[PDB]
Amino acid sequence: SQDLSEALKEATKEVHIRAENSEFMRNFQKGQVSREGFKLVTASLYHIYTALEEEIERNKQNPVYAPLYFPEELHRRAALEQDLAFWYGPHWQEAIPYTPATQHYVKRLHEVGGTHPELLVAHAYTRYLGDLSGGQVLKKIAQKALALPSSGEGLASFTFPSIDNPTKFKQLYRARMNTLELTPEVKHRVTEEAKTAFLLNIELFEELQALLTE
Ligand code: HEM
Known part of the structure; x- marks a missing residue:
């Protein structure tokens, strides 16, 4: 569609x-989720958000991303650390796995944040937005x-204490996204990178499911 937020939803x-x-x-x-499975995804997501929010801080002032800077409201790294401590204990840092699919995702996150900041969105x-939707x-x-x-x-990683209404907040987030100035071509590259993003998550779920089956 015309507005980026609509084009992303469609794509x-x-x-x-x-x-x-x-x-x-x-x-x-x-309702079929096990303690082992939930630990796995949480660990994997800790890495993904660590890398993601590290790239965000790097471009918080870049015009191509600036409008989406919401550290207090969205950042998930700290909350994930709280969950990991709960599940793995004080030394979670050294006990948690770092799967191939997670690393492949983290990699993509550094490339983009590093050389293609306009796609970080x-x-x-x-x-x-997934955390504020299906995540709820x-x-x-x-x-x-x-x-x-x-x-x-x-479940701290699913909790956004600084947000009164996720549905309302998503509308505000979409508004901000539609504020980004970019050509139709770059906009296409954006929707195209969001598919890649979903594919990285899909691949990550397939891998964990494979790991769990035993
Ligand atoms: C358990 C599986 C899932 C269910 C049942 C689910 C359900 C939903 C629903 C109902 C919405 C619409 C907004 C709302 O009414 O809350 C939504 C939106 C969304 N979901 Fe999911 N979801 C799931 C998994 C995922 C995953 C794994 C991702 C990303 C990696 C994701 C990313 C998104 C995004 C980005 C939107 C917003 C789309 C837009 O409006 O532009 N979802 N989801």
Whole structure:
């Protein structure tokens, strides 16, 4: 479509359905998630967000990204560290895995943030708006399926205390995205990089599912 936010939604509709149909997610939605599986994804995401937010800080002043800088509201690295500490203990840093698919994703995140800053939006969009959407549904399912503390320990990465209303916040995020100045061509490169982003997540779920099956 014309507005970037609409073009992104249109461009990733197919890979989104594919992400929901991935074995790992299908099971998660139906309440079939294990402590081992949840630990795995959380660990993998700690790396992805670490790399992602490291690149964001690098371009927080770059006009091609500046409008999407929301450290207090969205940044997930700290929350993920809290979950990892809960699941793996004080020495989580050294106990957590770093799978091939996660590294491949982290790599892409450094390339983009490093030399293609105008595409970082595609990656932030894919992870953050997803956390505020499907993530909100999954959060509730996980607390039940994993019989977690009613206080929220273990699910801090799904919690955005600095956001009163995710739905409302996403509309504001879309507004900001449509504020970005870029040619139709670069805009296409953006929607195209968001598919790549979903594909990196898909590949990551397929790998973890493969790792878990045993
Ligand atoms: C358990 C599987 C999933 C379910 C059930 C799900 C469900 C949804 C729903 C219902 C929406 C629409 C907004 C809302 O009403 O909340 C949405 C949006 C979105 N999801 Fe997912 N989702 C899932 C997995 C994912 C994954 C794995 C990603 C990314 C890696 C993702 C990324 C997004 C994005 C970026 C949007 C916003 C699209 C836009 O409006 O431009 N989702 N999801």
